[PDB]
Amino acid sequence: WTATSGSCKGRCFELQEVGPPDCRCDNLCKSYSSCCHDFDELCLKTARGWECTKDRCGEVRNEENACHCSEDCLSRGDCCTNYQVVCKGESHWVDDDCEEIKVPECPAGFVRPPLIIFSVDGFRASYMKKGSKVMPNIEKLRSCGTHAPYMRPVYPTKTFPNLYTLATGLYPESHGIVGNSMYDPVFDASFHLRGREKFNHRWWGGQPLWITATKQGVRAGTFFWSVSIPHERRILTILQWLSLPDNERPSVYAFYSEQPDFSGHKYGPFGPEMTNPLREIDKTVGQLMDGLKQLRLHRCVNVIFVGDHGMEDVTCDRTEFLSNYLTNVDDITLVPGTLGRIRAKSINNSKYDPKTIIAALTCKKPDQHFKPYMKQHLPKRLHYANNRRIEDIHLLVDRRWHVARKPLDVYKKCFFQGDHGFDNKVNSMQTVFVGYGPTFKYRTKVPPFENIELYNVMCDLLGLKPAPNNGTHGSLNHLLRTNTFRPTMPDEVSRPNYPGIMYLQSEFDLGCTCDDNKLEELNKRLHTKGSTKERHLLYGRPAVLYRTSYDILYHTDFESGYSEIFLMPLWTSYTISKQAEVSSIPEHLTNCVRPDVRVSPGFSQNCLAYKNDKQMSYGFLFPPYLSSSPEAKYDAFLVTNMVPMYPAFKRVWAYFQRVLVKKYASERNGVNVISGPIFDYNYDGLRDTEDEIKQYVEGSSIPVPTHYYSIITSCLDFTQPADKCDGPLSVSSFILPHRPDNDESCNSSEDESKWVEELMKMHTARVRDIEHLTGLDFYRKTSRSYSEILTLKTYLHTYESE
């Protein structure tokens, strides 16, 4: 109940929203049916349109007008945005040459440059080029400010998840808005686009920018607009707030456009009907920039133009139906569309089995346009698992497709030609970033980056300390002229031991077997002391950022940090030059596993547990195939280079090691590789402690990794060998799930050359993802600036064309 009896006179677009039942005059009041009776009349004036004309110039102020062309309008701060152009012979902002903004040029009394965030729903990254003729204002922001060729959204590439990630710097799994539609089993409530429940505060985790600003004494403009308030009125309101006295004036403002998403759904991302919404967005930016120029604020304000996600071609006929796969289709609830989430229709049905649902959905039709996953098996790069609102069963849908439960669902709701929500690496889902203002660089292109990074930059732009978030603070320093955040490397928590030869062969009872001069006796000793370590450890050793017990182990071909707790390396580092040659494992060595005389029996794995364990086999982190000499090859068979691997995963791993590593070395002019295991049993994206481990090799204390990573670094200028690189580096990485089958790869009964590399590409990763997952910190010793290294660690090789 609102007692909507009060008035909006002098209260129009009030910045602090007043408590019910007293009636509201804020920019959100409509969406709560809480506006005062006079709201439309006083606050949503429309009389005479949105532009001055020759004859309106110098008029006597008529308060009924939408915007004013009277002499006093400037001081009052309510001129039509084109006032100085029509009435005072000024040019539109878009027609002025760009001129570097070296310092904020602000009115007296501004304590900091304001920030205006202009967000555009569904503005696909390629619109910047493809619509450039019809967007002259946006193009001036882009070419004159700082821009990326695209910005990567989060998954799912839906509106609420993305806008809330922009607000908070958090993955959907951490901020809680994991979809446009949601069921929270703890609350026993549902969240939908339509309706009331989405307003409840308990959905919305982390700390969004407006709250971060308020808590630190920076005033925030209300970010949210009732959809019926026209764009022109939103702009005029922002311009008005900017004319408030110093003590009342917000420092941050948000404009949101429903376009071009709204049209893109009806017409497809490139439908001829898409030109007009692009034109209309540009005209709005034009009104903002003209308005700012009138207030002499156009070289004072920082402007961010940002989208939430792109838009792909999707139609009704491209729908897969679960009723074509599942005989039990009525015992499940499906969250449908460009992704799928499945749970039980009723928690009192004890015969609902997720395992058989997955199996009934796996590789069933030759061209199947979705792939089922238990959520913990989704690519770790999506960070989409650690929230009770995310159903155990997930369908990753092919771009251009929909999944639905039954055909009735589709023709009882073709309506649409565009949709979004797909995997966030998909090109059609990429969106835009442009920054313009005194704090951004001038005419600068930056590489693509993820929207999780922006909250930190918006905090930097406002002088705020950001709440804990998933950006890597400093990785976007190269967007900024000043206000950079200068981080230190985290301190190493555990120092390693450097064990020498301490154990006799006969002390080892591991059930392991191996059929195995003074010049090269001193030589092998110096290799064990770390003489080739500068060849194999190019960027320093990784720092261990938690308390644990580990050893550095040197060898001719590789260096490793061996964990006495997990009985295996945390990391193994080796360099493969362009010249290097693949040899095979000789037969006298096929099942060779050798005790490592530097490491006690008690901190070692044993062959017997592998023999006993009928499901589990073993692989090696340094590949024997790439040993530098037959003598060095013995080092690769050390029990300390051994890790648990399912036979089905060995197919993957062997092909990577035997074929792909050499291929990358030829193509990249040497590669440095760091490989190791990952334990993420509770799927939170963070290194597990030992008491979190759910699986061991039968009858032993050997813990089973959930994933295996590799980080493959070379010189960005590939005319220089990886081990002799003078400048910036180039990286690609992966986090492969360690799975007892290859059900994920539909063509896996074929030759590894037809499916392994595609699987690795699917599970591409940022070094930073690996850092979270291992508690390690990489590239500690390079000659590059730390900010540049943070940028490299956030890089994701996506394997999408141009």
Ligand SMILES: *[C@@H]1O[C@H](CO)[C@@H](O[C@@H]2O[C@H](CO)[C@@H](O[C@@H]3O[C@H](CO[C@H]4O[C@H](CO)[C@@H](O)[C@H](O[C@H]5O[C@H](CO)[C@@H](O)[C@H](O)[C@@H]5O[C@H]5O[C@H](CO)[C@@H](O)[C@H](O)[C@@H]5O)[C@@H]4O)[C@@H](O)[C@H](O[C@H]4O[C@H](CO)[C@@H](O)[C@H](O)[C@@H]4O[C@H]4O[C@H](CO)[C@@H](O)[C@H](O)[C@@H]4O)[C@@H]3O)[C@H](O)[C@H]2NC(C)=O)[C@H](O)[C@H]1NC(C)=O
């Ligand atoms: C991305 O960045 C984010 C932000 O940095 C990272 O997430 C953080 O990770 C931290 C480490 O896991 C986590 O720290 C925990 O905090 C607990 C206190 O939590 C509350 O307070 C904070 C601060 O204001 C608040 O933000 C939290 O909000 C969460 O919860 C509500 C839902 O209830 C949501 O509104 C909100 O969306 C958010 O949910 C998300 O986080 C939780 C985990 O906290 C998930 O479970 C959800 O699915 C969702 O993803 C909270 O309101 C604190 O209790 C924890 O302490 C336990 O563990 C430590 C180890 O240090 C130990 O000292 C303690 O004893 C304690 O254990 C006790 O409780 C256990 C659990 O009940 C119990 O089993 C034990 O026996 C013990 O008695 C812990 O310190 C932090 O909260 C989140 N922050 C956010 C915002 O998510 C994230 O990791 C990054 N991602 C990646 C990949 O890097």
Ligand SMILES: Cn1c(=O)[nH]c2ccc(C(=O)N3C[C@H]4CCN(C(=O)c5cc(OCC6CCOCC6)nc(C6CC6)c5)CC[C@H]4C3)cc21
């Ligand atoms: C059906 N469906 C789709 O498939 N795509 C859709 C797209 C839109 C709609 C729709 O009309 N809506 C009607 C509403 C329109 C108004 N909105 C906001 O004011 C808003 C802004 C906003 O900014 C956050 C800033 C943070 C700083 O960085 C820039 C962005 N944060 C939110 C929510 C997250 C807190 C909502 C969008 C949401 C609704 C969505 C419905 C859709």
Ligand SMILES: [Ca+2]
């Ligand atoms: Ca959207």
Ligand SMILES: [Ca+2]
């Ligand atoms: Ca974990």
Ligand SMILES: [Cl-]
């Ligand atoms: Cl959703």
Ligand SMILES: [K+]
């Ligand atoms: K076995």
Ligand code: NA
């Ligand atoms: Na398969």
Ligand SMILES: [Zn+2]
């Ligand atoms: Zn949409």
